[PDB]
Amino acid sequence: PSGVEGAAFQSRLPHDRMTSQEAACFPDIISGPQQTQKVFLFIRNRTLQLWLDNPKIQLTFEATLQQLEAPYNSDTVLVHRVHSYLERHGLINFGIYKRIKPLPTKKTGKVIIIGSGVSGLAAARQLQSFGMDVTLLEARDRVGGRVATFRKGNYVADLGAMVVTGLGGNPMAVVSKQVNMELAKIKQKCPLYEANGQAVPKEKDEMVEQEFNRLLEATSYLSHQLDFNVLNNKPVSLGQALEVVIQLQEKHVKDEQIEHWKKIVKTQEELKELLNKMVNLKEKIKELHQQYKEASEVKPPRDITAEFLVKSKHRDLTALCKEYDELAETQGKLEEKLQELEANPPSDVYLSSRDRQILDWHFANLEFANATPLSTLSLKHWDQDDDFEFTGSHLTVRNGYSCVPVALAEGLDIKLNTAVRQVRYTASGCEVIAVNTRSTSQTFIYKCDAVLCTLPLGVLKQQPPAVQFVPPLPEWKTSAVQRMGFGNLNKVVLCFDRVFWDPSVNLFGHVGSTTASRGELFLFWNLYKAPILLALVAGEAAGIMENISDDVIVGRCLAILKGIFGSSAVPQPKETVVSRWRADPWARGSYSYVAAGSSGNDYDLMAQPITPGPSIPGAPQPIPRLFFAGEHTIRNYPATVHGALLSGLREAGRIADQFLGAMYT
Amino acid sequence: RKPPKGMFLSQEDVEAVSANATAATTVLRQLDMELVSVKRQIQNIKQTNSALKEKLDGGIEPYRLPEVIQKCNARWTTEEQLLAVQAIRKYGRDFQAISDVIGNKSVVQVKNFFVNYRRRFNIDEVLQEWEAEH
Numbered sequence A: 001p002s003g004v005e006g007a008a009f010q011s012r013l014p015h016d017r018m019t020s021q022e023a024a025c026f027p028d029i030i031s032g033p034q035q036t037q038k039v040f041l042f043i044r045n046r047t048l049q050l051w052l053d054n055p056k057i058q059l060t061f062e063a064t065l066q067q068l069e070a071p072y073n074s075d076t077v078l079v080h081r082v083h084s085y086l087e088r089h090g091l092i093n094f095g096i097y098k099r100i101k102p103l104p105t106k107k108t109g110k111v112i113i114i115g116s117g118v119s120g121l122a123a124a125r126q127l128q129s130f131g132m133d134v135t136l137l138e139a140r141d142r143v144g145g146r147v148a149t150f151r152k153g154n155y156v157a158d159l160g161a162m163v164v165t166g167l168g169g170n171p172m173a174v175v176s177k178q179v180n181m182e183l184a185k186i187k188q189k190c191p192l193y194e195a196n197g198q199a200v201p202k203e204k205d206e207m208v209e210q211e212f213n214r215l216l217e218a219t220s221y222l223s224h225q226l227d228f229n230v231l232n233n234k235p236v237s238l239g240q241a242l243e244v245v246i247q248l249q250e251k252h253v254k255d256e257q258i259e260h261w262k263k264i265v266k267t268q269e270e271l272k273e274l275l276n277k278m279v280n281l282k283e284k285i286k287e288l289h290q291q292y293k294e295a296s297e298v299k300p301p302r303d304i305t306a307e308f309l310v311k312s313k314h315r316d317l318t319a320l321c322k323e324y325d326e327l328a329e330t331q332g333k334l335e336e337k338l339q340e341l342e343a344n345p346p347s348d349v350y351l352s353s354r355d356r357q358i359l360d361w362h363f364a365n366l367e368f369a370n371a372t373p374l375s376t377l378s379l380k381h382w383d384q385d386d387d388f389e390f391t392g393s394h395l396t397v398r399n400g401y402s403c404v405p406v407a408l409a410e411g412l413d414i415k416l417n418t419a420v421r422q423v424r425y426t427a428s429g430c431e432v433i434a435v436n437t438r439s440t441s442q443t444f445i446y447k448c449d450a451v452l453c454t455l456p457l458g459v460l461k462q463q464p465p466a467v468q469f470v471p472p473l474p475e476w477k478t479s480a481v482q483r484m485g486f487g488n489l490n491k492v493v494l495c496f497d498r499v500f501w502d503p504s505v506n507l508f509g510h511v512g513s514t515t516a517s518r519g520e521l522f523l524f525w526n527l528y529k530a531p532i533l534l535a536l537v538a539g540e541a542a543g544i545m546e547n548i549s550d551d552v553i554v555g556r557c558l559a560i561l562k563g564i565f566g567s568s569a570v571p572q573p574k575e576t577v578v579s580r581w582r583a584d585p586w587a588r589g590s591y592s593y594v595a596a597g598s599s600g601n602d603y604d605l606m607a608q609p610i611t612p613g614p615s616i617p618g619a620p621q622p623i624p625r626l627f628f629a630g631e632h633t634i635r636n637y638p639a640t641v642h643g644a645l646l647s648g649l650r651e652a653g654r655i656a657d658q659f660l661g662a663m664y665t
Numbered sequence B: 001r002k003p004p005k006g007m008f009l010s011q012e013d014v015e016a017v018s019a020n021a022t023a024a025t026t027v028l029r030q031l032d033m034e035l036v037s038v039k040r041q042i043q044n045i046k047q048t049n050s051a052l053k054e055k056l057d058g059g060i061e062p063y064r065l066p067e068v069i070q071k072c073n074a075r076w077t078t079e080e081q082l083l084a085v086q087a088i089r090k091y092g093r094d095f096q097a098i099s100d101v102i103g104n105k106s107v108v109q110v111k112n113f114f115v116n117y118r119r120r121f122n123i124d125e126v127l128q129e130w131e132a133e134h
């Protein structure tokens, strides 16, 4: 999309229609005449275009009205209302940009943000930009949370987020223009290597992948058309569905083998009946021939009765001889019909042991993307966010993703090594109790008007809780937390002194021997400047490998590589790093997934702010005080960096609207 | 509203495999056993047919008679008429058989005999005689 329509697409908005959010802020416009709506849409789209064309500088109201042509620039208030709406909702003026109108020294409202990850940082920049007093409390000795980049000398490798998913519609496209992001396209060519170390030929690679996609498509049919979503009172998982489909394919291979034999036996029995008929006919022919011979012995001249015989027997023998020839003619047809069937058997198996192993790699790859075993994914909803995918090719941050959060941290009040312990929210305000991670006895008290909680879902799931809420969170909030899934996936950074792998190849795979260990170091990445190889641990393997020491993990990595490139081609690594996201107290996993028994609605529930009860009985309904942002709080874009980023922008707007008022409504 | 082209899924098959924790294995095992049951049944009949083929070795060659092709004569000799009468008694209405027994009379000439010598050769009696024994 180009022009103003491109601007709407880049902002995830329909160009020819007003959204529900816009309807709420502009009820007078959406309910009014169609013409006015078109005037609103144009102003909105153009203002977006202006900001997108140059996201390195603040787009002010005056600068917007200046670049608008008649008649749209006549209604100054409508332009101001649209501009403020976009600014407040972070559709324009978000991230890192040069401020034309310096931040006013006088602040309004106090906000404490828990966590300095992407979602927390995005919201902080916005809240500060709106004129609020903002302080961030981070438990780690760094920012970025799940955006962690390993840096040593020239070695740069991401241990957390690493992939940007398409730029079309991605808020990360703007960020990449504000930050020195060295984005590089990901070459999708991925060669596979079996346990023995030998490559998988193109024929098999394509045949198995096609089958993998066919199997996924089948589970969808099984869910939408056959309504197989609940079995034994339990929600059906993606793994269960896939297992069923595979079993049914094995069944068909067998209902076809049986049918093909059964056709052979039917024809085989037709031959039996025909042969029996032929044998008995040969007997009668033998008998008649002897009778004819005996009758022929009666030498002429002879009476007509003797003459009737012989001639009468000749005719009977000739007639029976015709019958045998026609029966022998049928014997030749059936005989070759059996030779055709015996030469044309159906498929022996659905998938061989070798085929199943390669298929397991594809399932492991899916377990990597979802950061969870397929048996935990909700069949009905695992792909609920597929319709919101960005257009374009996936990229990688060549200079480490951490450049984003580090850049977004500039000018912000961030308290590192500060672990929040308790969150207190009342009708008059909030107080957050936190301690020093280096010396737990040292306690800190933070008073504020509102609290923005960006704790990972894994942390919120902790039992016993790491962070206590007072009063406790309502059942509707905790039940969502328990239903939602929080997966895991790990990475092994292997730093070498030379390149022994294929440089033109961005990534290659390792096919495991068993289904159980399918996700164990199944994929190796080659995306950085320095000779670095990154191994991935997915599925059931992720959780188990965390209890295995680094040395043993690195050993397995080398063993796999030695079997592929040669035992002498792989030297001992100079540097190695192993991530353990599940054991990490500030994460307790990698990212959220749609678990069986959950749905996209839980994400909405996670986003809902908490409003405390009144302090005094009979006092008016209080203000919402506790807010939530984070990857696990954005239904359309969860388990991503852009989603986190967007969730922060959402809360910043909601908080400002509540504590600063919305003049544009 | 359709499974992938080549994939097979049906409400009946899904229910049968997911009936219990061992239904999947049970279904596949019962099909595996039914395959062996039919495979051994094939070799059994293959052996039976092979033995029947040996009993047909040589075919019907030593029992084959040469064809005595003779000129089709229009006139009926006393001997030919008597051959017909006995043919009608043995074959009934199979004009083709009767004609083949005589050798030099066409199918139409046989039918004409049935009407021409109907009374004189008691064909009515001869025909009912054949019906009593087929």
Ligand SMILES: Cc1cc2c(cc1C)N1[C@H](O)C[C@H](c3ccccc3)[C@]13C(=O)NC(=O)N=C3N2C[C@H](O)[C@H](O)[C@H](O)COP(=O)(O)OP(=O)(O)OC[C@H]1O[C@@H](n2cnc3c(N)ncnc32)[C@H](O)[C@@H]1O
Binding pocket: A114, A115, A116, A117, A118, A119, A120, A137, A138, A139, A140, A143, A144, A145, A146, A147, A159, A160, A161, A162, A163, A164, A165, A369, A418, A419, A420, A421, A454, A455, A456, A459, A466, A467, A489, A490, A491, A581, A585, A586, A587, A589, A590, A591, A629, A630, A631, A632, A638, A639, A640, A641, A642, A644
């Ligand atoms: C861990 C991890 C994550 C990813 C990835 C890999 C790993 C190993 N990758 C994988 O390669 C695949 C996955 C992906 C690829 C393609 C499409 C979609 C997804 C990806 C990736 O590259 N690309 C991506 O966009 N997101 C990923 N992600 C997910 C994103 O990184 C996250 O969704 C996002 O960065 C999370 O942002 P957030 O702000 O919502 O959460 P945190 O960044 O954890 O912030 C929470 C903060 O609270 C702090 N905290 C915890 N307890 C505290 C406490 N008690 N007191 C104070 N602070 C506390 C934590 O230290 C942390 O700083």
